[PDB]
Design a protein around this ligand. Structure first.
Ligand SMILES: [Zn+2]
Ligand SMILES: [Zn+2]
Ligand SMILES: [Zn+2]
Ligand SMILES: [Zn+2]
Ligand SMILES: [Zn+2]
Ligand SMILES: [Zn+2]
Ligand SMILES: [Zn+2]
Ligand SMILES: [Zn+2]
Lengths: 420, 418, 418, 420
């Protein structure tokens, strides 16, 4: 236990009356709306989202990285911090690894995860940066590089990510590369895409029967003119061409300005190619900010589509969700905790939508009442639901508050010497 | 001849000397670069782009419309003006009609075209506005409207466009609707798209083998929250789903800010779904401005993908090129003329690209030289070639100058009600 | 009374039981946060936003207009509909008129307003479209047109607006123009701005001592390349140059993609040039959609700045708020009603912000808690406070429901032509 | 000479014939247009743009950095590299330093400059990153930070930059900070701006009589929610508040999507607050790509505004232009060489515009001929002019090729230690 259980008990107990009071008042409100709070809380308790191992360390920009105290160094420190998030929120039982950043003895990794109450989600390859001793540089690309040997090296690396994953209980490989161009003419759009497809096919072959291969699109950065896997369009083409085990990941901040992202999610669901959604928020580009800190309604609308599919069924709908953020000015553990909270909030509110009435208003072209139908769910403060769900599953009523009272940050600060 | 042949001759002779000097100098420059200027002029003389019948009249915004003098009244006046663009540029031999705005007797349309020296490009259906006497309003959609009757009506209108088209020489149906929503929840994305797909399939059945069914995506406007056919991604799903004769249409100004459009072009070409282009320029949204008036380089880069397609030997690749612009503050004829000129300008520069050298710099990851290889073609002032091509084919060295020296605007201003 | 009072009371009783429960519960919740739900309600009852006389009529785009039943015709019909919005929501006691659209005997407008329980807000001049019998077209601009006569005509019209407003009680003139260019070179940015400044100076001279002159910026549309008053930066230059009675209007959907609108509001407030805010919502451009229907948090954040201004004790702060929306796919009356409610919602949420706690987290750079302090206020469902505010002031608990139960649309649909 | 003269000579002679044919042809074409080419060349050979010392090193993103061979070791190697750019383009006689990065004995900096034929442009302060031993971190800001001692520390640093500048011949301080917030509520917008204005006033107070203070706006990055100096509006307010010596710097890639940047330039000129223009090119955000590589027409339109200023007779307009770019996938020296060329290219075309005819078309609202009048200039290939200008001033007819023929990169690669 990273956080002392008595601390959690103590903090949860001092707030129990306040929680009960809010949970009952909201229950009566929902009752009058033909909604059983219990059924909502039970689904909220089972909604999980994978945490990225690299998310608990302080992020930065090309201009600077301002570390806080107790920076986790290495996958072990990182797992230890991810455990706090899971313990207090009970919404992140699985961690997503990144190779080579988190390379370590498989057996040791698994053992550490099991001891912490954490599992492992999709593996993440890295061919957007060069590692020491690497024979071929990825400066000009990897899987789509013009040099065959470089592509081969990129493919072999992704294969190794699978072998590591197979050994720790993982069932998928996410592939996000920087590949693209910064100048017009630098790359031949079609030929680079062909090279990419060809290299991905080889990785696809190394896929066990129960594994999936996720490709992630991004409009720009690190490439500033063109990017091989630039949008969900190219992303769909990829998934369809690779096969059944290949699907597309939709990362909120990876789209052009004003893009209707929730429609992209619905389009992928329909054609059974939505592998999963990567949560974060943005205002300008791929800001990788805390989920819901900028546009919480947008987040709700995305979840509205997920819930529609989750309820109405849909062939091939088994999303692998993950938070992908950079925490440059906050305590990384606190931001991930509140972001996971935000993700469950949007989920919970999506569950309140009256699907029948909505469908009626859409059929009648009653736009005002259709949008109002969503707003009724969205405007609902489901915090008591999120907190109770946490309380019933070993979590903290108020995660951040509990995390602060535990002095966890100061503790790892004493154990982890900083640069200065 | 909408324009007096003597006016054309006078204004050409007035610029002949200068064109000879410019053409020979560029000819010499290109020879040093290993390019035969005659081979380019020959290709430029063959590049054509369709003019929109509805682009010959002054356009407007939701705030106002400020018509100029001699506004065309009806499709026949419009064809008369389109003939001027063709006569002077020799690059716009085909007119794309819009129904029901251009509804008229087929035989007459065909005859007028033949007399003016104009053919007919793709037909354009219109279910994004209610025509008088219409049974069902498209207020809430057409091909994807929730009401079955409204959808059938829209389907029927599209089939009718095909009938009118067969009788006048058209070989394609362009489908662009405003279908979408302005509010979250108003529509169910998936079901709306399913309806659209079923409707389009019905239209596909009635599509002749010598025709192409072009669907056109747009991010927003008229719909401000979501649009059924919002981007090329959906456009590809549509075309793929519909059949070998269904292709995607790419309108330059119909994309999200900063979208790399030339890549969209390359992607569609690779999967054989690039039906054609709708040229125009923009800076903010779907501004429908004169081609290359805002970003001429982007226009060159789009054409760079087109010229590369041919070089890479892509089979059956014959995209239909059409200009889709609104002229709110200029003489629609001059704009269209210069827009067509700009399009040909971009194409000619693209032809100057040293494909071998570019391929070499791309393989060796010499980004600087690869970009400079494109710039060397783009920086070349190809006006001499554009002017010569026009001259050798009956056009004007300086189209707009000739157009103004004829007093055509004043003329039709006196023949048409103000 | 446009809406039968028996209906208003019947629909309120029908929901009076559920409301009391929700109200008491929120009251209890707020008390635990050290907030007296009555003080909040008291201030919400006093928050007003003006309604545009042109907003009650169905809006459209350059592609089509899909009118509904009983479309109002003329100012008097529009005032009748605005009265409904005011009666049910009690948040729109003032109407903003637009000339020449609403030109009519001032004495009559004044009387009809007093009878309907409506006042008149800022006047709106119209030089972005031509009226019949107009001597000079505004095709190429109005207050900044190169033609002196045209600028003079634009100035007189605005002066005329001031006069009509002086007779009906208005205290401000709002000037939004389309003036700009669609092509590079068409306008000399500086010369054009100079002309605008000089002309606005003349309109300023016709301002009574207690009036305000509001200049409204807009990035683009109808001008697609450049706009004389393109952003708040240029807007500030205008207000600072004209004088103390000149201020800037910030319209939500008139900004570039991703712009931080709330910072703009704060900057203008800091320098005393925030004349007022124009509410609506958007996703792509100047969509003019219902306020908060797309991005409610942004709406809330704008109000957070408005509320903080009072908290810091900004002197002379009296913004003239107004709704500026286009309703193309819903009953205009219904949309304006929910827009006004959404506005009050953001306002009430802004009031719930624990300023002491917030400044505390800002001071010690506790970003996470600072942002959570806002969220605690924003996430709070204040509908009961809004519904209770309307009930106590003669409005409806569920305005749109009451409106639909009254059958008002069918009524005016019968009294008015199709 | 960084580049041997026999090489520059040989390469020039190799291209003399083609240059002669293209220049004389163009000259004739211009004569037929009523333009004397010699007059353009004479103005072109005197147009200078300052080069950033931090631009001759390979740049990177927050994802990776892929250095090339011969990366400059310190400021002295960097000046050496800038000397090559100057020798070959003859368009970048001045270098802009960045403190503390370029810290060194002012006497030695000045001496190396004079020795290489380089002058020093605007000084650049750095409070967007933490240098060793600071009493306070700029993590949450610098000049607008809530902590008084932190702001005082940033102020002092800027004053030190001025002292170094005065010792080496600089006449200005460029201030660009990262200050802002990544979360709504994190900063009180107004309080932060007030703190920034007060602090900047103190820096202003340290300005010599003939120095200028340039404040540079930027929409986002590193801050992803709000930025203190976010746009030209805020920038104008700053310059007007500080005084006559304070002006605004306009960096191309620092504006929101679709922004009309040329108008901004016009607006700042009209009110006398355009201190200078930082050149680069972009497509998505602050891409910092080679100038004119993405949108050459927009570059031309910016110059059109600069030149129209002289046409309208603006007095005392002497803007301080600088290139501010990041070269992640090219030889920095080559990218800087071609960017400088592109800038002179756009400047030359702007000089070719028929202002007389243009003012006529603007007055009678002939939109079409007005736009075509600019195009007739922009479409003109002025390369021959740029090349001749370089030949006349000791530069190379084709800088990049001459640079490659010299083998300068391999030479410095064998002299400079790669970081380990
Ligand atoms: Zn991701
Ligand atoms: Zn990302
Ligand atoms: Zn189109
Ligand atoms: Zn269009
Ligand atoms: Zn407005
Ligand atoms: Zn507007
Ligand atoms: Zn800069
Ligand atoms: Zn920058």
């Amino acid at each position: 236990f990273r956080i002392a259980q008595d601390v959690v008990a103590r903090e949860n107990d001092r707030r129990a009356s306040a929680l009960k009071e809010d949970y009952e008042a909201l229950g009566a409100n929902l009752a009058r709306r033909g909604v059983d709070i219990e059924a909502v809380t039970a689904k909220v308790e089972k909604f999980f989202v994978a945490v990225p191992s690299w998310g608990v360390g302080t992020g930065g920009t090309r201009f600077a990285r301002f570390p806080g105290t107790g920076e986790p160094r290495g996958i072990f420190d990182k797992l230890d911090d991810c455990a706090v998030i899971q313990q207090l929120t009970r919404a992140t039982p699985n961690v997503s690894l990144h190779i080579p950043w988190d390379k370590a003895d498989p057996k040791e990794l698994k053992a550490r995860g099991d001891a912490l109450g954490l599992g492992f989600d999709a593996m993440n390859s890295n061919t957007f940066s060069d590692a020491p001793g690497q024979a071929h540089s990825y400066k000009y690309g990897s899987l789509s590089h013009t040099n065959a040997a470089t592509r081969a090296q990129a493919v072999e690396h992704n294969l190794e990510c699978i072998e590591i994953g197979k050994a720790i209980g993982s069932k998928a490989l996410t592939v996000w590369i920087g590949d693209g161009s910064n100048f017009p003419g630098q790359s031949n759009f079609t030929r680079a895409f062909e090279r990419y497809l060809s290299a991905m096919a080889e990785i696809y072959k190394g896929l066990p029967d129960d594994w999936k291969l996720f490709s992630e699109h991004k409009m720009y950065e690190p490439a500033f003119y063109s990017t091989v896997v630039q949008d969900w369009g190219t992303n769909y083409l990829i998934a369809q061409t690779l096969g059944p085990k290949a699907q597309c990941l939709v990362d909120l901040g990876h789209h052009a300005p004003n893009t209707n992202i929730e429609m992209i999610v619905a389009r992928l669901i329909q054609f059974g190619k939505l592998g999963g959604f990567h949560f974060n928020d943005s205002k300008y580009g791929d800001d990788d900010l805390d989920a819901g800190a900028i546009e919480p309604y947008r987040l709700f609308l995305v979840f509205n589509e997920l819930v529609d599919a989750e309820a109405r069924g849909v062939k091939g709908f088994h999303p692998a969700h993950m938070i992908d953020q950079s925490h440059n000015v906050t305590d990384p553990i606190e931001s991930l905790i509140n972001s996971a909270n935000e993700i469950r909030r949007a989920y919970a509110q999506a569950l309140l939508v009256d699907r029948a009435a909505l469908s009626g208003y859409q059929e009648d072209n009653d736009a005002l009442m259709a949008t109002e139908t969503l707003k009724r769910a969205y405007r609902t403060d489901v915090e008591p639901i999120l907190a109770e769900a946490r309380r019933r599953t070993g979590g903290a009523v108020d995660p951040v508050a509990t995390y602060r009272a535990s002095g966890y940050r100061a503790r790892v600060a004493a154990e982890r010497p900083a640069s200065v």
